[PDB]
Design a protein around this ligand. Structure first.
Ligand SMILES: [Cl-]
Ligand SMILES: [Cl-]
Ligand SMILES: [Cl-]
Ligand SMILES: [Cl-]
Ligand SMILES: [Cl-]
Ligand SMILES: [Cl-]
Ligand SMILES: [Cl-]
Ligand SMILES: [Cl-]
Ligand SMILES: [Cl-]
Ligand SMILES: [Cl-]
Ligand SMILES: [Cl-]
Ligand SMILES: [Cl-]
Ligand SMILES: [Cl-]
Ligand SMILES: [Cl-]
Ligand SMILES: [Cl-]
Ligand SMILES: [Cl-]
Ligand SMILES: [Cl-]
Ligand SMILES: [Cl-]
Ligand SMILES: [Cl-]
Ligand SMILES: [Cl-]
Ligand SMILES: [Cl-]
Ligand SMILES: [Cl-]
Ligand SMILES: [Cl-]
Ligand SMILES: [Cl-]
Ligand SMILES: [Cl-]
Ligand SMILES: [Cl-]
Ligand SMILES: [Cl-]
Ligand SMILES: [Cl-]
Ligand SMILES: [Cl-]
Ligand SMILES: [Cl-]
Ligand SMILES: [Cl-]
Ligand SMILES: [Cl-]
Ligand SMILES: [Cl-]
Ligand SMILES: [Cl-]
Ligand SMILES: [Cl-]
Ligand SMILES: [Cl-]
Lengths: 219, 219, 219, 219, 219, 219
């Protein structure tokens, strides 16, 4: 990656960053929290470091292939929006990146460093990471085994566990924020057990989650 | 985070900081000592690092949602107290942060660095951490299974263990310091077993905890 | 290795880089993901560091000997393409590297540093790593126990597992990218079980992997 | 903490310093060797780092409360010896610390850094650590289960084990150095078993511990 | 060791370098791969660091004594080839090292640093490491339990395992490279089982190891 | 410790140096290899760091007390050889250290840094470490359970194991180097089993250990 005196300098990906990413992939598969962890382990990463993290994953090659196809889609869109201009690269300049250059497959490390350190900067690492996180979200949604409509509180289930399952599945839903606002507004109280449901209905339409869980505590 | 020559510089969150936070969350849930540990693992953290630490938590999504609602409350209050002034941002200045900018959801990393390194500084990281610690305290209080009024010394319980339970629950109470002074002043001696209670009454109203535990040692 | 102020400086290979490489070799043998991991653990490595990583491998001496022979082939080709010019090395210059100099067996550490830090640079470390990765690919292909033509979906096998095996073996194939495009275009749908095969045929010749796996999900 | 070019600079407490302190507290309770370890893990620590180390301790809240009371005693004494002078803080100066400022509860991190880096320095971190180590010594003495007068050599106990127990308990005694000189001068030879006691009496009043243990070796 | 701005600076040997060397010695005894690992863990090491690594080895004191005798032989030879010149050391110079000075037993750390940082340099660390690696090779050869003449393929043994044993023992042989070329040229095909031996004879005298192992794959 | 631009700077003792020293003390007691490890973990250490390493040792308080007495002996001798001169310390100078100042009990950290960084330097850390290593050698010799005169080869014992035990005990002897030369010259061949003893007698008085162990290999 590249780390900030003021100047930005490049260093290799660390052994325990590699081992941490491999470990979390091997242990957690494609649970939603893997996406921030990835984004955490790839701060300021070049496309070479991102390809390094993706390639060190053994197994799950169906999901990794889907990730390849998503990356290729975003690269093709970048090529459509950024048409290349023919002409020799002048002294004191650098060529404009293509879709495959941001993906790190047709660009050297020195070119990526040059794009990322220029003023103004061309952040190929954050663009590539954006595409990767897009594909990862597609995979997390695709591998989720539950739907938010099926989360229903059991007759003896404590309210805290029901809310845990509900917002876990809701985190795996990854629909828009307004759709999630509606899901929280309707399904959570709607799909509670009769007692807790009655009490939550008695709370009112503008109750917070803290008040809702406090109301059904001893229940 | 940002680390201090004199100049403050930015670096990525470390792999063992991430793994340490994930580990302590997975092992200790929401015991009070998790709050300082968090504050320890996020020294000089940007809002991006704080969101990184919060998002890498799998499970406990009810508590994390309550934390989201608390953060949104504090952000709305910040917006109420700091009304934004319309006008183009002049060369040599930066826009004033909104509530969602301090929360890191509507501000880039460069903007957070700029606010945090300016003279005078706008410490968005410590404000956001303040809100987060507020919500975490709400969660710790909400998930505490015991009340300080129910802590009573057993007939054969050593005094040290009773004081341990008492001040553990008292730490989970998180009422004001004067209320805790009164709780220590009344309940501790009041709820001891008859023998130790008699001896502590014989000590006097101004005895220290060291003297109280010394008095009921062999007892 | 050599790490980037701007100037490139040299430091020793780290203990946990060594232990990480030894560990991944001992645990994963010659699975394809070992090649990027290697390339990850040897960023900016000198030929001395690469020889260090190769020599610390105990066992697998057949594969390591094959790697030696591949390295010698690439070195002989480098000598054929780069004939050495006789003459004394002038003050302010350095000799041009031979095949064995890039392989680190006839060149000192100071010579490798000098080649790698000169302007223009002679990247002996990346050339040697290129040869090493070539031989490693030969070994990975040679030790693969399965062929892509034998990957067939079971009558009760979920489609995701079948695609996992398919693209794992395909990753071990390491034929050209167009040949792999044809393999994906023909064998994947061709070798599915009758039900999923019928549905995929109904999808159309231009369906993505995401659409194909979505179609055979409940199936 | 603050680490030494010449200038003293501040950095956050490290994850493995935190985990090391938490681990040693969880494993060793309040054995005497915990006090140097603490002092080792808090070299150059600010009051914020010391409060961080104390607050991350879960359980043992009786001892931690006693530590709070000791710290408050030392702070009150500091306030008695250092009366505050009223007046506005002049440009180029900083206010003088109170007892609670050294304890880190009423002083910001910037104020602690300013006191610790000024010439002449006001070492609030070493003063606070001094108070903390005082309270920790009180706790170690209070939780010691044995008294030095009860350490007596068994009829078949090797002399080395007896001396081990003796100086362990003596380390837990923490009386003045002259009192410990007398304890070593009298009890050690006095409380040995009859044979070893006779031989040590035959050694003479000025024998070293090496000579004493050599004399009762084969015995 | 000493690590490279440009200037070479000295630092202490790291705890995990020590623990790594102790661990690999305790686990792998004197397998050939211990020699590169050693050379890896002692890059740029002073004679003091090398003596540190050798002295921390508990047990195997026969091999360590043999290593002492080899080091003394090489030191005596260095003294024979480099006779010392009598005379006072002039201001701006340093004495020439003896055999025991390179071995670190009669030279201080400052003298070793001075020799290693001078221009032109006297690399006492690499000379001492050269002697140490010589003795280590003698020990590895002496503790090898097998001879290359006894490696014979079993009637049901896969060819890959036979080549593994063959080149393992060959690595333990450590004869000259031409002798090893002859051993590979004769014994490998000569000592294979009848079927594989017939096929390898049918391959021809100029076949690579890759072709030889490919020929006897299904066999 | 203090680490070398050129200038020597001070930093705190590291958590894994502490944990490494505590671990090796807990696992290996007082085997000879603990002394170099100690000397390895305390390179450039101040007297405060050395006292830190000694004080963190729990248990073995008999040996630690003997170490205290040895340190006090060496300090008293230093005071006898270096009489203190009365007079005020002039501006631009520092007081000369006493025995207890080198031991770190009557000198602050700043005084130790000042002595260690002055030109010419007063290396109080290496003097204190010298005394500590002296006492540690006394303890290692005192706790050795075997004498070199009792090491005798068994009738079926391989020669390598016998030499291992012999030089282990010899390392624990710690007599002068000429006495050890005589012990190797006489006892090793003298105390071998009859067969190996006959063969070694047939070797001659000037045989190396390599030749001696080679002679009794198959025997
Ligand atoms: Cl995996
Ligand atoms: Cl370009
Ligand atoms: Cl662009
Ligand atoms: Cl963009
Ligand atoms: Cl509940
Ligand atoms: Cl569920
Ligand atoms: Cl969790
Ligand atoms: Cl702005
Ligand atoms: Cl503001
Ligand atoms: Cl503010
Ligand atoms: Cl008690
Ligand atoms: Cl309780
Ligand atoms: Cl292996
Ligand atoms: Cl040259
Ligand atoms: Cl060239
Ligand atoms: Cl090239
Ligand atoms: Cl499926
Ligand atoms: Cl398969
Ligand atoms: Cl604890
Ligand atoms: Cl002030
Ligand atoms: Cl003051
Ligand atoms: Cl003071
Ligand atoms: Cl004894
Ligand atoms: Cl006891
Ligand atoms: Cl060992
Ligand atoms: Cl000299
Ligand atoms: Cl020389
Ligand atoms: Cl030389
Ligand atoms: Cl085979
Ligand atoms: Cl074998
Ligand atoms: Cl111990
Ligand atoms: Cl002074
Ligand atoms: Cl002196
Ligand atoms: Cl001296
Ligand atoms: Cl033997
Ligand atoms: Cl023995």
């Amino acid at each position: 990656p590249i780390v900030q005196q003021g100047q930005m300098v490049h260093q290799a990906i660390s052994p325990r960053t590699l081992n941490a990413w491999v470990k979390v992939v091997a242990e957690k598969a494609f649970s939603p929290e893997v996406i921030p962890m990835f984004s955490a382990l790839s701060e300021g990463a070049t496309p070479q470091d991102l390809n390094t993290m993706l390639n060190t994953v053994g197994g799950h090659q169906a999901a990794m292939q889907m990730l390849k196809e998503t990356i290729n889609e975003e690269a093709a869109e970048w090529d459509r929006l950024h048409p290349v201009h023919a002409g020799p690269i002048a002294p004191g300049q650098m060529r404009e990146p293509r879709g495959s250059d941001i993906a790190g497959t047709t660009s050297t490390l020195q070119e990526q460093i040059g794009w990322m350190t220029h003023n103004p900067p061309i952040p190929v690492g954050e663009i590539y990471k954006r595409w990767i996180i897009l594909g990862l979200n597609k995979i997390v949604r695709m591998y989720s085994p539950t739907s938010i409509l099926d989360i229903r509180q059991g007759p003896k289930e404590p309210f805290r566990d029901y809310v845990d399952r509900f917002y876990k599945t809701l985190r795996a839903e990854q629909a828009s924020q307004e759709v999630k606002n509606w899901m929280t507004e309707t399904l959570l109280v709607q799909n509670a057990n009769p007692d807790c449901k009655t009490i939550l209905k008695a709370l009112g339409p503008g109750a917070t989650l803290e008040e809702m869980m406090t109301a059904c505590q001893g229940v």
